[PDB]
Amino acid sequence: GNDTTTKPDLYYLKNSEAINSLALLPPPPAVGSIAFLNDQAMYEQGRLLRNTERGKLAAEDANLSSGGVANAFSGAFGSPITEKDAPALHKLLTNMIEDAGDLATRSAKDHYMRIRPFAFYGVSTCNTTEQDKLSKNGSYPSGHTSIGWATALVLAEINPQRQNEILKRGYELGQSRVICGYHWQSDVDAARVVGSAVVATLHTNPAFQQQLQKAKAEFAQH
Amino acid sequence: GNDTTTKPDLYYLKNSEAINSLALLPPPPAVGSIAFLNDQAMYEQGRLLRNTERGKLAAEDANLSSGGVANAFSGAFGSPITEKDAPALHKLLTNMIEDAGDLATRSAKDHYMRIRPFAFYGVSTCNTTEQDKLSKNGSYPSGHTSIGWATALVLAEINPQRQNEILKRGYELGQSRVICGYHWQSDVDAARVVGSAVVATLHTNPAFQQQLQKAKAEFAQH
Amino acid sequence: GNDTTTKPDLYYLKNSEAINSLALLPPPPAVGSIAFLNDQAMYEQGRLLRNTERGKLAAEDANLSSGGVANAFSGAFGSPITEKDAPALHKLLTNMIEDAGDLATRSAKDHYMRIRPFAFYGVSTCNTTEQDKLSKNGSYPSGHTSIGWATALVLAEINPQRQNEILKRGYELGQSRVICGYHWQSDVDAARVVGSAVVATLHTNPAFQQQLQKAKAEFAQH
Amino acid sequence: GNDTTTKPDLYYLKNSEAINSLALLPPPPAVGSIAFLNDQAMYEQGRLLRNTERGKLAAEDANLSSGGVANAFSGAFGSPITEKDAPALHKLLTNMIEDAGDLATRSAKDHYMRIRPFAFYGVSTCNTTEQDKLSKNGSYPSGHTSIGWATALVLAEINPQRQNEILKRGYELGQSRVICGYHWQSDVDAARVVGSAVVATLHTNPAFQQQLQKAKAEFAQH
Amino acid sequence: GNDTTTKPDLYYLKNSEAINSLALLPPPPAVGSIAFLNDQAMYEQGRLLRNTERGKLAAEDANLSSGGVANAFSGAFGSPITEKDAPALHKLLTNMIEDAGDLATRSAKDHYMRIRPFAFYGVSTCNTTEQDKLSKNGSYPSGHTSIGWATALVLAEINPQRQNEILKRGYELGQSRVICGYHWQSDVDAARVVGSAVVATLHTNPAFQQQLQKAKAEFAQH
Amino acid sequence: GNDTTTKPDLYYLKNSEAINSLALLPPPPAVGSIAFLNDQAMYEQGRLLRNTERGKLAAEDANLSSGGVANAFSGAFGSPITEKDAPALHKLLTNMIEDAGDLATRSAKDHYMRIRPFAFYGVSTCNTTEQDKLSKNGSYPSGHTSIGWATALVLAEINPQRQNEILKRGYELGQSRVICGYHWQSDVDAARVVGSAVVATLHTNPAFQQQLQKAKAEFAQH
Ligand code: MOO
Ligand code: MOO
Ligand code: MOO
Ligand code: MOO
Ligand code: MOO
Ligand code: MOO
C-alpha cells in the first residue's frame, strides 16, 4: 500500500516504519462471543442516537479525508486550524493522516476483514459518502478512530493547556463511528491502541519532528 | 495527592498538568450490562491461565514501582535498561512512573472506586503482595496498565527498530493485571487511553524533554 | 396535560393528586444491559405469538379508550359491563381510564420517552390503529397496562368471588401490548406498579367513592 | 395454612378468600434463561450494596414480622405508627400482614419452591434472623415485598398527601430483599402484583373496612 | 404417517418401528434462553459464510432428496456412488433416506413445530428449492442432518479406511443446514442423536441387512 | 495409547482403528462465548438436582467402569444383564467400554485438555470416586456419555421392542455427568457423536460381530 514514498503529503512514514497492528492487536470479537453481543448492543444504542445532535455531529464526523480532520478539531483546539489561519499546524495534521488511518491499521484490517454493522445488518451508515468505498474495507481496527486519537494526541502537545478538550474530541471522534454505523465498538477501541503507537514512530521521524517544531512555534505567536 | 512538587523523583507533571481521566473516559461497565458479563468471562479466562507460563509472567508483571517497569522492558528493548547500563534511560523511565500511574488515573479511580475482581470474588490475586495496598484503590482504570503503555510509547520512540516488541510487552504488562485477578478487562483497556494521553503531556515537559534527549544520546551507546 | 379539571369524564384526580411515576419507578432497562436483552427475546416471543389465538386476543386488547376496557372484562366479570346493563359499573370504569392511563404514567413516560419496539425494529404492531398516535409517546411505562390492572383491582373488590379471573384478564390486557409489539416487557411490568398505586389514590376520591358505591349497590342486581 | 380463623390477629381473610398466585403469576425465570442471568446480575449488584447505608437499611428491613412493618413505614408516613401513638392504624397494619405475606403468596411459593440466592450461592443473607426458617420457603414470590407493597398501598389511602414517599418505602422495602440475599429480583417483582391484589380483597372484607375506617379517622385528628 | 408400506423405495422401517424422537429428545431451546441466543449467533455466523466456498457447498448440500445424498458422499467415500458404479451402495443410501429423515424426526418435529430461522428472520434460505415445502415443517430436529449422520455411519461401516472422512462429511452435511438457514444449530445437534439411533433400528431390518451386505461386497471389486 | 493389543477385555478396536475425535469434532466452547455461558447455566441446573431422585441416579451412573454399564442398562433393557443371566450380552458390553470411552475421545480430549466443571468451580463432584483420576483428564468430550450412547445403540440393535427405553437411558446416562459435575453440557453433546461413530467401526470388527450375534441369540431364550 501507499506510504510516504508515494503520497508524501498524506504520510511521513514508509511501510517499513509501520506498526504491525496484526501482531499487536488481539483478534476481534467473534460471532457467538459475549463481546460481539456487546458490539451489537453498542450499535443499536448508537443507531438510536443518530437522530440526535450527537448524531448529526457523527455524520459530519465521517469527513476527515482531507483537511477535514483539522476541521473536526477546530473548536476543541481553541484557535481555528485552517490552511489560511494556521497552515504549519494544518499541514502537520494533513500530512500525518494516512500514517494514522492506513499504516497503523493495515495489517489487522486486511488480515481479519471483519465485516461492518451497516453491512452486517444491511442498513446504511449515517453518512454514506465513503460507505461503498469502505464497504470493502476491513472493519477492524477503525481508521478514523486511529486518526482522531493520533491527531488529538498530537494536538495535545501543541496546546497542552487545552488537552482535555482536545483529547475528548479525539475520543469523541472515534465514537461517532459507532453512532454512524461504520464500525463496531471493538473497532473503535482497538484503533486507539494503534493510533497512539504511530504518534510514537512519528516522534522519531525527522520530517515530523520539524513540522511539529514549525507548528509549535507558529502557534506560539498566534 | 502527590505530584512532581512533593515527590519529583516519580513525577514530572504537577496535579495541574494532569489529564482529566474522569472526564475523558467513559463510565466503567455496570453490574447487569453485557459489558460486565464480558469482564467476568475474561476474569475466568485469566484465572485458568494463572498456572501457565503466561500466569508465570503475569505473576512478575506486578512489581514495578521500584522501577521494575524498566526491567520489565529490558528484554524487549534488546538492551538492558538498568541504573548501571542505561543511566539516562533508567532515570527517565522512573521519574515518570507516577505521571502515568497516578495522575493519569487518579481522577476517575477515586470517582468510581470500582471494585477489583479479587475482591468482587473473594479469591485472592496471582500476586498477593500489593493486593492489600490496592484493595482500597479504585480498579478503573488500571495504573500498572497505564504505565506499561506509557513507558512503551516512550521506549518505542527511543528504539523504533524494536517498537513492535516494546509496544507488545507494554500491552502485555497490562493484560497480566487481568490474568492476576487485579483488574477487570475494562480497566486495562480504558487504561491505555490515559496511558497514551499522558505521554502527550510529558513531551511538553522540559524535565521530560531533557532526559528523553539524554536517553536518546546515551542510547546510541549501550 | 389534562386531568379531572379539563376532562372530568375520564379523570377523577387532578394533576395535583397524581403519582410520581418518574420518582417511584426505577429507570427502564438500558440498551446494553442483560435486562434489555430480555426485553428483546420477549418481543421475539410475543411476535411469533401474534398469529395465534393469543395474538388474536392481543389484537383486540388494544382498543380501550372508548371504554373498551369495560368490555374487555365483561367476559371475566361473569356479567356484562355495559352502558345499558351496568350503568353505575360502566361509568365508574370509564371516568378513571385516564387517572390510571395518563396521570399514573405521564411523569416517567415523558421523562424517558423510551422507544417502543415497533419503532425500535421498524416492524409495525399487531394493531396499527393507535400505532401512530403512540409512536410519539414514551413506551415506559405502559398505559393500557396500567389500566388493565387498575380496572381489575376495582372490579375484583366489586366482584371478589371472581377476582382471580378479573385479575388474570387485567394481567393479560397488559401482556397483549407485549405481544402486539406495542410495549417492551419491562414497560408492562413497571406499569402494574403505578397501575396499583393509582387505585389507592382513587379510593381517597369522593367522586370515585360515590360511583364505586353505586357500582356495588347496582351490582347486587345484574 | 393459617388464616383469619386461626390467627385472626395476623389475617383478615380466610384461605378461601385468598388470591391464587399460582394461577395469576407467570412461572419464575428458569436457570438457563436470560431473565435468571439478570436475577444473578441483580444479586451481585445487591450484594455489593450491602456494606453501604442502603445496605444497613436493607438488613434492618428484613424485620416486619410483628409491628416492625409499621416501624419501617414510620418516616415515610410522617407521623409515627406505634401501638401507643396510633394503635388503630398500628392494628390495621399488624392484622393485614399475613394476608399479604402468606395468603397472597402461598400457591406459587409452594408450587415452585424456587431456591434462594443465599442458598444458591451458599453465602449468608445480610440479616440471618429468619434465614434458616425461610431457607425452606419457596423463594417466589416474596412475602416482605407483598407486605411492603400492600401496606404502602394501604397507607397511601390514609395519608394520600404523602403517598409518593409512602409508596417509595413500600417499593424500597421489596428491594431491600434483593440487596440482602433472600430473594432474586424476579421474586420481588412478582410479589407486587399479588400484594396489590390482596389490598383489593381486603377492601371487601368488613373487618378491614372497619379498621380502615378507625385508622382513617384516628389519624384525621392526629 | 408415511413409510415402507406406502413408499418402500425410501423407507426400510415401518412407522411401528419409527423411533420416538419426541421422547428421546429434549425440547428445543426457547426464545428467552441463553442457548437460543447462541442459536441466533450461529445463524448470523452461518449467514456470513453463505457466499464462500462453504456456502456453495451448503447450498448444494440442500439437495439430498434423490441421490443427492449419494452424490454428497462420493468425494468422501473415496469412489463414486452412482446407480451405475456403486449400484448396491447407491441403492441402500437411496431407500433409507426417509427412515433417517422422516421416521426419525416426525414426533419431535410435529409436536414442537419449531420456527425455522429463515421464517424467523424473514430471510430467504441459501437454496430456496425446498424453502416453501419446509416453511411449515417443524424445525426441531433437522431431517437433513439426520440423513447426513445416519448415512455417514452406515458408509463408515462399509469403507472403514476413511471413516474420519466419510464421517466428517456427514457431520458437515448437517452444518450446511445452519449456514443455509433452514435449521438452528440446535436442531442440527439434536438431529444427530435420532440420526445415529435409526442406524440401530436399521441393523435390525433384514432388508437393510441384505442390501448393506451386498453394498459391502460390491465395495470389494470397485 | 491403550487398546486391545494391551487390554483386550475392554477393547475390540486397536488404536490404528480409533476414530479421530479431534478432527471430526468442533472445539469446545470457550470462556467468552455465549455457549459456555449456557454450559455454566446447565452446570448450575445440574447442581440443583444433585439431591433428588435424579441426582442419586446420576451419582450411580458415575459407575460404569466395570459392569456398572451393564447394570446401568438392565432396567431399560427389560431383563437383567449379568455375567450369569445375559452372559453373552454382559460380555459384549464389557469389552467395548474402552473403545467408546477411551479410543473414541482420546484425540479431542488430549489435545484440548478442557477444564472440568468441578475443577473449574472448585466444588467436589457428586460421586468423588473418580474425581481425582479424572481431575486431570481432558473434559471435552465425555467418555462416560460415549459409552452410554455407544452401548445404548448396540443394545437397541438387540432388543428393539424397547429401543426408546434402552435409548432414553443411554441418553440420560450421559446427562448424569452434567448433574454430577464431571463434564459440561457441551462435552456431553459432543461425546454422543464420537459415541455413535464407534458403533460403526465396531460393526466392522469380526469379534464384535461374533459376540453381538451371540448376545442377540441368547436374547432369544432369556
Ligand atoms: O475509516 Mo473507518 O476504518 O471506516 O474509521
Ligand atoms: O496498579 Mo493497578 O491500578 O493494580 O494496575
Ligand atoms: O398505551 Mo401503551 O402506553 O401503548 O399501553
Ligand atoms: O419473606 Mo420473603 O418471602 O423472605 O420476603
Ligand atoms: O430437512 Mo430439514 O428438516 O430442512 O434438514
Ligand atoms: O469419563 Mo468422563 O470423561 O468423566 O465421562
| DSSP codes, B175-198 | HHHHHTTSS-HHHHHHHHHHHHHH
Residue E90 a catalytic site member: no
> How close is the Cα of A119 to the center of ligand 3, in Å?
34
Residue of D nearest to F41 (CA): D32
Please state the φ and ψ torsions of residue B33, each to the nearest 5 degrees. -110, 155
Mutate to test the interface with A, among F33, F37, F38, F39 (most CBs of A within 10 A): F33
Residues in B lying within 8 Å of C, measured between beta carbons: 30, 32-35, 37
**Beta carbons of A164 and B108 less than 8 angstroms apart:** no
C-alpha grid cell for residue C136? 410519539
For E3-10, the CB contacts below 8 A with 24+ separation are E3/E98, E3/E102, E3/E103, E7/E98, E8/E95, E9/E94, E9/E95, E10/E94, E10/E95, E10/E96, E10/E97, E10/E98
**Beta carbons of B134 and B116 less than 8 angstroms apart:** yes
Peptide bond into F141 cis (omega under 30): yes
Q: Write down the residue that cell numbers 476491513 correspond to.
A: A138
> How close is the Cα of D196 to the center of ligand 4, in Å?
16
Q: Which residues of F touch E193 (CB under 8 A)?
A: 171, 192, 196
Q: Report chain B's terminal Cα–Cα distance, integer Å.
A: 37
Method: X-ray
**Beta carbons of E151 and E93 less than 8 angstroms apart:** yes
3-state secondary structure of A31: strand
Pocket test for ligand 1, best of A105, A106, A177 (most atoms within 8 A of CB): A177
**Beta carbons of C183 and C145 less than 8 angstroms apart:** yes
**Beta carbons of C200 and C189 less than 8 angstroms apart:** no
Angle formed by the axes of helices E185-202 and F163-180, nearest 10°: 140
Q: Where are the beta strands (DSSP E) in chain A?
A: none
Distance in angstroms (rounded) separating the CA atoms of residues E180 and E173: 11
Distance in angstroms (rounded) separating the CA atoms of residues B92 and B111: 30
Contacts of D211 (CB under 8 A, 6+ apart): D12, D88, D91, D92, D95
Of F174, F50, F188, nearest in space to F114 by CA: F188
Angle formed by the axes of helices C34-49 and C163-179, nearest 10°: 100
**Residue minimizing CA distance to atom 4 of ligand 4:** D182
Distance from CA of A45 to the nearest CA of C (A): 6
Q: Write down the residue that cell numbers 522512573 correspond to.
A: B94
CA atoms within 13 A on the CB side of A143: 23
**Beta carbons of D182 and D142 less than 8 angstroms apart:** yes
**Residue minimizing CA distance to atom 5 of ligand 6:** F144
- Residue E176 CB burial class (10 angstroms; 0-12, 13-18, ≥19): buried
**Beta carbons of C149 and C196 less than 8 angstroms apart:** yes
> How close is the Cα of B48 to the center of ligand 2, in Å?
20
Contacts of C34 (CB under 8 A, 6+ apart): B32, B33, B34, B37, D34, D37, D38, D41
Asked if B33 and C30 come within 8 Å (Cβ–Cβ), the reply is yes
**Residue minimizing CA distance to atom 4 of ligand 5:** E182
D106 lines ligand 4 (CB under 6 A): no
**Beta carbons of D11 and D111 less than 8 angstroms apart:** no
Residue E183 a catalytic site member: yes
Angle formed by the axes of helices D185-201 and D163-180, nearest 10°: 140
What domains, with CATH codes, occur in chain B?
1-222 (1.20.144.10)
> How close is the Cα of D144 to the center of ligand 4, in Å?
5
3-state secondary structure of E210: helix
Q: Which residues of A touch B168 (CB under 8 A)?
A: 23-24
Q: How many helices (H) does chain D have, and how many strands (E)?
A: 13, 0
Distance in angstroms (rounded) separating the CA atoms of residues F196 and F15: 17
**Beta carbons of D25 and D141 less than 8 angstroms apart:** yes
Q: Residue F15 gets which letter from DSSP?
A: G
CA dihedral D62, D65, D68, D72 (to 10 degrees): 40
